[PDB]
Design an enzyme around this catalytic site. Structure first.
Site, mmCIF file in Angstrom:
data_model
loop_
_atom_site.group_PDB
_atom_site.id
_atom_site.type_symbol
_atom_site.label_atom_id
_atom_site.label_comp_id
_atom_site.label_asym_id
_atom_site.label_seq_id
_atom_site.Cartn_x
_atom_site.Cartn_y
_atom_site.Cartn_z
ATOM 1 N N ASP A 81 -6.327 6.265 -5.344
ATOM 2 C CA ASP A 81 -5.746 4.941 -5.584
ATOM 3 C C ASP A 81 -5.964 4.481 -7.050
ATOM 4 O O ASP A 81 -6.453 5.263 -7.873
ATOM 5 C CB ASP A 81 -6.320 3.912 -4.580
ATOM 6 C CG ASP A 81 -7.813 3.602 -4.665
ATOM 7 O OD1 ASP A 81 -8.512 4.229 -5.493
ATOM 8 O OD2 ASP A 81 -8.280 2.728 -3.904
ATOM 9 N N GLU A 118 0.801 -1.232 0.000
ATOM 10 C CA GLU A 118 0.000 0.000 0.000
ATOM 11 C C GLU A 118 0.840 1.293 0.000
ATOM 12 O O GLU A 118 0.364 2.321 -0.492
ATOM 13 C CB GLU A 118 -0.963 0.036 1.206
ATOM 14 C CG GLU A 118 -1.988 -1.087 1.255
ATOM 15 C CD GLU A 118 -3.226 -0.948 0.389
ATOM 16 O OE1 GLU A 118 -3.305 0.006 -0.419
ATOM 17 O OE2 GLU A 118 -4.107 -1.832 0.493
#
Ligand SMILES: CC(C)CCC[C@@H](C)[C@H]1CC[C@H]2[C@@H]3CC=C4C[C@@H](O)CC[C@]4(C)[C@H]3CC[C@]12C
Ligand SMILES: CCCCCCCC/C=C\CCCCCCCC(=O)OC[C@H](O)CO
Ligand SMILES: CCCCCCCC/C=C\CCCCCCCC(=O)OC[C@H](O)CO
Ligand SMILES: CCCCCCCC/C=C\CCCCCCCC(=O)OC[C@H](O)CO
Ligand SMILES: CCCCCCCC/C=C\CCCCCCCC(=O)OC[C@H](O)CO
Ligand SMILES: CCCCCCCC/C=C\CCCCCCCC(=O)OC[C@H](O)CO
Ligand SMILES: CCCCCCCC/C=C\CCCCCCCC(=O)OC[C@H](O)CO
Ligand SMILES: CC(C)(C)NC[C@H](O)COc1nsnc1N1CCOCC1
Ligand SMILES: CCCCCCCC/C=C\CCCCCCCC(=O)O
Ligand SMILES: CCCCCCCC/C=C\CCCCCCCC(=O)O
Ligand SMILES: CCCCCCCC/C=C\CCCCCCCC(=O)O
Ligand SMILES: CCCCCCCC/C=C\CCCCCCCC(=O)O
Length: 443
Positions: free
Chosen positions: A222, A213
């Protein structure tokens, strides 16, 4: 001895001296001027760069003059002194590398993991101690003439101010070679192989998810397109910045304005990964697959729940059945045959490998703190690659003197000499040193 050989080798020796001096003052200036580079590890690196700067200024130029002129034109006093400094620099280098290796072991085995247990005060004390002890084991056996041989070829070279060929007795060439090089080398290779073993075995879900991440203290979008912050913390499904900024303030309990601190991001990451494991134990389809798996494979399942969600992973009805039956490679192909693999291929392949291998080998040297250990391993590794052939031919000469020529002895010593200029280039691996170099070179 042709004109193109003496000028040709003269130019490369001059460039080698320049690359060693420039490169090492660059490193010493970087650590002395930039506070971010003021660490105990970098204190041992400046010790290593100092020996390298002393090499390029006091040993390599006078060594180059001895090759081109094919004689020593600096007297018998500077001859012994030049050799003493040469030995001091190689001894101090391998002993600082040994100290780094030991310091890295005590750090990785401590709860601090990547922080040394030494303070800057005692680190300096350790550094001057290696130089005082190395200076004593390098200057005393040469100044007292304990190294000197008793054969004609040797005794005649000592009397001649024109000669500075390193002639030694078989006792000095074994004792000084194992005490100044082999003992710190053997310890360093045994201790640093354990730090790599520890870093890999100590890898957990928290380090694994920070790899997959990342960490961004500012609000960003994202791969899915939705708003995220910190370590993969989804804020809202709404395509609105103020909507994501509102749910941000509600999670911390203060007016964030879109910026977060490491303490807040770690706190949010801890409850996020706790919610992922909580969901697994509540979900009837994920709970038995979790119990059947091992500690490392459990992390791979948590990771999937962290990213896709509890109900998302439960959709892999076939793959989960394969993981319980412990059919890893058969689970992998089904996991490859998914939308998750297409959307995040670099992340999915790592998680799939973790299910197959059941090790942390896919997450090998992925962490920033691990890259730092790899860089230090390359520094240690090239040093031994550059010095070991010279030190092997040194302990072979004592058994049989006629087995190896004088021409190959200087060549292998120069393979060790060019190492003194590689270390600054290896620091370009660190972004901290990279940013430092660019600023000092004004690019
Ligand atoms: C041939 C002889 C005279 C040369 C020896 C040079 C000596 C004085 C040099 C070489 C390496 C140097 C050290 C390199 C590393 C550090 C860490 C730094 O944060 C503080 C100073 C300190 C501790 C230096 C002190 C001086 C030092 C020991
Ligand atoms: C040809 C090779 C020979 C030159 C060798 C060394 C020069 C050193 C170059 C390093 C740059 C000088 C250091 C510097 O950037 O200066 C500090 C500045 O004041 C910011 O604080
Ligand atoms: C040639 C011998 C040494 C060169 C080493 C270079 C000296 C180290 C750089 C020191 C420096 O210029 O940095 C000032 C800094 O601001 C202070 O905190
Ligand atoms: C002649 C070479 C002398 C080189 C001397 C370089 C050692 C000093 C140094 O590297 O500076 C670190 C500084 O003290 C950190 O605050
Ligand atoms: C043998 C080599 C000995 C070198 C000593 C290294 C000391 C060190 O690195 O420190 C470990 C730890 O911090 C201590 O509390
Ligand atoms: C230049 C090649 C580096 C050789 C050093 C080595 O032996 O490899 C160990 C290193 O830690 C592997 O990442
Ligand atoms: C050797 C010739 C000296 C040229 C110096 C140089 O190349 O400049 C350093 C750096 O690029 C400055 O930004
Ligand atoms: C031979 C000459 C030119 C003086 N170079 C020395 C080498 O670079 C390395 O010297 C050493 N540093 S630590 N231990 C040694 N040696 C190598 C030579 O034999 C005695 C012990
Ligand atoms: C021969 C001597 C050649 C080079 C050594 C001098 C280099 C020192 C420059 C330091 C300047 C600085 O970074 O503050
Ligand atoms: C002699 C061996 C020294 C061992 C250094 C400590 C590191 C370790 O325990 O692996
Ligand atoms: C063998 C000789 C040198 C190896 C280089 C030193 C670096 C430590 C090795 C790392 C490891 O074995 O895992
Ligand atoms: C790259 C390093 C290669 C060469 C550096 C030059 C030093 C060579 C020393 C051997 C000279 C000789 O005696 O033939």
């Amino acid at each position: 001895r042709d004109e193109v050989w003496v000028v040709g080798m003269g130019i490369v020796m001059s460039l080698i001296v320049l690359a060693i001096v420039f490169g090492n003052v660059l490193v010493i200036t970087a650590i002395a001027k930039f506070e971010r580079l003021q660490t105990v590890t970098n204190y041992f690196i400046t010790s290593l760069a100092c020996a390298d700067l002393v090499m390029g200024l006091a040993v390599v130029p006078f060594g180059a003059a001895h090759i081109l002129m094919k004689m020593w034109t600096f007297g018998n006093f500077w001859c012994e002194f030049w050799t003493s400094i040469d030995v001091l620099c190689v001894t101090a280098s391998i002993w600082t590398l040994c100290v780094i290796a030991v310091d890295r072991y005590f750090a990785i085995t401590s709860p601090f993991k990547y922080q040394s247990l030494l303070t800057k005060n005692k680190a300096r004390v350790i550094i001057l101690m290696v130089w005082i002890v190395s200076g004593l084991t390098s200057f005393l056996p040469i100044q007292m003439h304990w190294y000197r041989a008793t054969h004609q070829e040797a005794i005649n070279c000592y009397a001649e101010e024109t000669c500075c060929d390193f002639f030694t007795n078989q006792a000095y060439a074994i004792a000084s070679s194992i005490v100044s090089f082999y003992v710190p080398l053997v310890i360093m290779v045994f201790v640093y192989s354990r730090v790599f073993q520890e870093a890999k075995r100590q890898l957990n879900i928290f380090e694994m998810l920070r790899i997959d991440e990342g960490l961004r203290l500012k609000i960003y979008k994202d791969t899915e397109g939705y708003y995220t912050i910190g370590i993969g913390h989804l804020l809202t499904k709404s395509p609105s910045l103020n909507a994501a900024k509102s749910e941000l303030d509600k999670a911390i309990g203060r007016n964030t304005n879109g910026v977060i601190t490491k303490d807040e991001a770690e706190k949010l990451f801890n409850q996020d990964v706790d919610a992922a494991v909580r969901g697994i134990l509540r979900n009837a389809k994920l709970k038995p697959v979790y119990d059947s798996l091992d500690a490392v494979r459990r992390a791979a399942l948590i990771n999937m729940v962290f990213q896709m969600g509890e109900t998302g992973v439960a959709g892999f009805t076939n793959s989960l059945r394969m993981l319980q039956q412990k059919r890893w490679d058969e689970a992998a192909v089904n996991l490859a045959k998914s939308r998750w693999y297409n959307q995040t291929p670099n992340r999915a392949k790592r998680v799939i490998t973790t299910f197959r291998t059941g090790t942390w080998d896919a997450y090998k040297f992925c962490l920033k703190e691990h890259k730092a250990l790899k860089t230090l391993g390359i520094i240690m590794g090239t040093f031994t690659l550059c010095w070991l052939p010279f030190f092997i031919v040194n302990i072979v000469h004592v058994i049989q003197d006629n087995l190896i020529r004088k021409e190959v002895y200087i060549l292998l010593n120069w393979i060790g000499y060019v190492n003194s200029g590689f270390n600054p280039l290896i620091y370009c691996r660190s972004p901290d040193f990279r940013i430092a170099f660019q600023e000092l070179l004004c690019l």
